[model samples]
Target: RWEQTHLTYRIENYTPDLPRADVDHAIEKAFQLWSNVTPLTFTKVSEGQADIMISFVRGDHRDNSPFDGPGGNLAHAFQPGPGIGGDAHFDEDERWTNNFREYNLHRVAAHELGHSLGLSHSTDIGALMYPSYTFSGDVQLAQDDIDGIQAIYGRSQ
Candidate 1:
């Protein structure tokens, strides 16, 4: 588990599918999802090192897990730690959107952030932490995910 409740993230780059402002909003709201449930807080930084470094890259990005083009893997994140830990990499091959048209950046981001916060993929249906991706008109955290995260970081005070 992270030794601190406060976390920082930086978006190193943006995908062309959405506007920069849209990506920023999507990521901010994704962090808000976890903050709303746990005492943990996420702050965005423009420069300097952050706990999480978010970027969108396709295929092999010099990581052990090379992403496949298009579908299959949408994005991935590391557990809380140093270096690449907590960083999230999105696949640029997919059509990412801020809305529910295809792959919702906000929805996928929240799910990836869950992994960044130390929660693994869940077997529970309807969970944001589920292994598979599904889109809804809205983004929501299931009870399983809420309980899972709260177990690691505890409920908000």
Candidate 2:
């Protein structure tokens, strides 16, 4: 479990494709969907050790799981714990955007963060953690997801 109420993260690098401000905005918004129902708070920082280190890279990341290049294996994250255990990595080879029809940044970040926050893929195929990249047409966290995380962390206070 992510046993802390306060957690810090760092966007280690920005993808060359997007404006820095846009990338930063989507990450903040991504956590909102989760934080809306849980007391969890996230802060972004630079030049330090963070609970989660967000990175955009290509090919082998030396993190056990390697990206399959564009259009496949868009991203992955580690389960919550110490050190790099909760870091998140995205595939720079994949085209990213706010478009849900494409690989949505908000969508992927939240999904990977679900893992970082100790959520395994939900059994429901329509669930956000569908065990694969799934398209969401502008919705908050799904009922199953809200319940899953809440079961562990309790509701927002």
Candidate 3:
């Protein structure tokens, strides 16, 4: 929803698999995808807790929510709140690429942030928040996803 609070987030760690710059680029771009359409704004911080904390980890990473190795689960994020709320955990075993691959970092990050921002998976087939993941030459939010988000946060003025 529209948090009167401009959200803050931080990257807890980088997966050595992807270039550091690429990871940073992907994340900012992902956040922009949402922020561009909502009143929400994101600030990236380096120290202490943030509204969202992102990380890359392998199987059984010990969050009680163990990731199902590799392909099955690319990543997941908590719904909005405090503590572990809004934290995003990407499965390190999965290959994360910028584009034209099995998993696109920006795509997945955008979806996870959908969860972080108090949205849930959509039944709409083409929606980014759909339970299934697929790659497209052009990645943009589906109409269903956009409407759903606006329902929660209200449209960007």
Candidate 4:
């Protein structure tokens, strides 16, 4: 039998300089990308009642893994679970933009949230879960990424 999985998130503090609407839009886009590939359902949470929590921070915010300055480590997320496990963090130092000319916020968020959904980096460059970041022309997921997600959560109906 197919099991249903759902994910929820909350934004805890954000980069003061970033527009709130842009941030929200980018995150929603990220979540939607994953939902499109898997049976998992995602929702934004209020009042801290979410399975996942997204936040922006710089340098050593918390966690064992710390941000490596502006570019080296743009962002990261924990494996799915309760508490900090499903939380994702982005480096505020990097200039986030929807355009590929700058760091694509939607792309990074999508990648990080993949980790929050229990995915690790893929060796294949074509995979969205690839460990190293490539400045792809656009932030869309590659074919390998779609295959990887489907491998884990099964294909969407």
TM-score for each candidate, following the candidate numbering? 0.97, 0.93, 0.94, 0.87
Where's the lowest-lDDT run of ten residues in candidate 3?
1-10
lDDT of 1 by residue, 1-157 (tens): 7999999999999998998999999999999999998999988999998999999998889989988999888999999899999999999999999876889899999999999999998989789999888887767899999999999999996
Pairs in clash, predicted candidate 4: none
Q: Write the per-residue lDDT of candidate 3 for residues 1-157, one digit (tens) a residue.
A: 4356489999999988789999999999989878878778899999998889999998889788887777888898998878888899999989889778788898899999999998999998899999988877777898988898888887787
Off by over 4 Å in 4: 1-4
Top candidate on lDDT is: 1
TM-score leader: 1
Say what the RMSD of model 3 is.
1.3
Give each prediction's root-mean-square deviation over alpha carbons. 0.9, 1.3, 1.3, 2.5
What TM-score does structure 1 among the candidates reach? 0.97
| TM-score sort, best first | 1, 3, 2, 4
The better candidate by TM-score, 1 or 4, is: 1
Tens digits of per-residue lDDT, candidate 4, 1-157, equal 1234766688877666468888888889888888887898877876666778777887878787777777777888888777887788888888777666567787788889889888878887877788876667656777878887788788888
Model 1 spans > 4 angstroms off: none
Evaluation by TM-score, superior candidate among 1 and 3 = 1
- Lowest summed lDDT across 10 adjacent residues in model 2 is found at 132-141
Candidates sorted by lDDT, best first:
1, 3, 2, 4
